[PDB]
From a paper:
The 131-kDa Icm/Dot substrate RidL binds the retromer subunit Vps29 as well as PtdIns(3)P and impairs retrograde trafficking. Here, we show that the 29-kDa N-terminal domain of RidL (RidL2–281) adopts a “foot-like” fold comprising a protruding hydrophobic β-hairpin, which determines the interaction with the Vps29 retromer subunit and displaces the regulator TBC1D5 from the retromer. Thus, the hydrophobic β-hairpin of RidL is critical for binding of the L. pneumophila effector to the Vps29 retromer subunit and displacement of the regulator TBC1D5.
To test the possibility that deletion of the β-hairpin leads to global structural changes in RidL, we solved the structure of the N-terminal RidL fragment lacking the β-hairpin at 2.1 Å resolution. The N-terminal domain devoid of the β-hairpin crystallized in space group P212121 with two polypeptide chains (called molecule A and B) in the asymmetric unit. These molecules exhibited a root mean square deviation (RMSD) of 0.756 Å over 205 residues among each other, and mainly differ at the F-loop, which was partially undefined due to the high flexibility in molecule A. Superpositions of the Δβ-hairpin mutant with the wild-type RidL domain over the same 205 residues resulted in RMSD of 0.872 Å and 0.962 Å for molecules A and B, respectively. Thus, the N-terminal RidL fragment lacking the β-hairpin adopts an overall structure that is very similar to the parental fragment. Interestingly, the fragment lacking the β-hairpin no longer co-localized with the retromer and was found throughout the cell. As expected, the Δβ-hairpin mutant did not reveal any detectable binding to Vps29. In contrast, the addition of RidL10–258-Δβ-hairpin or buffer only did not result in the elution of the retromer. Thus, RidL10–258 displaces the retromer from TBC1D5 in a β-hairpin-dependent manner.
Numbering used by the authors: 8 to 78, 82 to 242
Write the structure that this text describes.
């Protein structure tokens, strides 16, 4: 068959997308992400174990993640092998899954952040973002040095910081759309035919110019923009 590294990567993305509307699932997911985050990815035996420890969580979303029709190795041997989680995965090794868990843990905390937190994320450069995330403990996650070996900082790659900003962009845009009484300006952003046009309309609505590098109109923002513009 194949190792489950990418499937866990995709399951993490899918559960987080669903956690935006199930507060009880978000608190479940936060605990799982917190456990992965405090496990050293350089210890493959501990890393496989902490993932297998949450089978009850994985089975509620995808029972294929933890399945293994024994008949070959036993299930215990399988769960401790590269056949379950390949520590030498060229793309989704334990470091990459550890970094993705932290990036998801931040995005999870951003779903409850106020407007100022979202703006600071978009204004700060990658280096400031890490120190800023290392200053909001444990709102956006425990990125102290006790849990990360480390300190993070590290686990938040530059590409991870960019995806965190993309999430804060959508969260902030939805807030501005749900707040502004400037109907014509909301029409302008809805009808922007280019990024520079979207930039000028979004900046006027309150989106910081420092976040223009990640500015992009997603489906959920256009949908919310369409409703609000037609809302009388």
């Amino acid at each position: 068959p194949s190792a489950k590294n990418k499937e866990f990567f995709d399951a993490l993305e899918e559960i987080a997308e669903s956690a935006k509307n199930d507060e009880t699932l978000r608190n479940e997911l936060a605990k799982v992400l917190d456990d992965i985050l405090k496990t050293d990815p350089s210890d493959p035996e501990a890393f496989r174990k902490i993932v297998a420890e949450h089978q009850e969580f994985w089975d509620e979303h995808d029972p294929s993640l933890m399945e293994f029709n024994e008949g070959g190795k036993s299930r215990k041997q399988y769960l401790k092998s590269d056949d379950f989680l390949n520590s030498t995965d060229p793309t989704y090794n334990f470091q990459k899954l550890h970094q993705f868990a932290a990036e998801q843990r931040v995005k999870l905390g951003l779903e409850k952040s106020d407007t100022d937190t979202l703006v600071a994320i978009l204004k700060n450069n990658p280096e400031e973002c890490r120190a800023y995330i290392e200053s909001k403990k444990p709102g956006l996650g425990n990125f102290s040095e006790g849990n990360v070996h480390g300190g993070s900082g590290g686990v938040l790659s530059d590409e991870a910081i960019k995806r965190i900003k993309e999430q804060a962009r959508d969260l902030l845009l939805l807030k501005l759309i749900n707040s502004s009484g400037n109907t014509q300006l909301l029409k302008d952003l809805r009808d922007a035919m280019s990024k520079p046009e979207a930039e000028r309309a979004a900046n006027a609505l309150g989106f910081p110019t420092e976040g223009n590098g990640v500015l992009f109109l997603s489906r959920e923002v256009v949908d919310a923009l369409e409703e609000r513009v037609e809302k009388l």
